[PDB]
Amino acid sequence: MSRVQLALRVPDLEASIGFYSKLFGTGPAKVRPGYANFAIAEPPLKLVLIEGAGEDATRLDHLGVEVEDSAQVGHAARRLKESGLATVEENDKVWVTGPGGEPWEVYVV
């Protein structure tokens, strides 16, 4: 259906991969320099780890909703705009930002 994407900026990518592998009982789906992600079935979650630049603590990088196909992104894009939110589309993604600055992407992988 759809799942939340949580992207964390972490000070230690390697330590974070080990921790999350244990927490969710599954290994990362993608690993490359400075980046890893996990595709978790239960709870439905795309977890993204971005290595920080000498960061002192983990912080939120961005948030999102991962959907099945482009049509769903388009539907979300139109609904969000009609609701009065300012949006930015990529062509597939739509971006909105919350009042305290937290960015959300609605996207298809």
Ligand SMILES: [Co+2]
């Ligand atoms: Co993302």
Ligand code: NA
């Ligand atoms: Na979810």
Ligand code: NA
């Ligand atoms: Na934060």
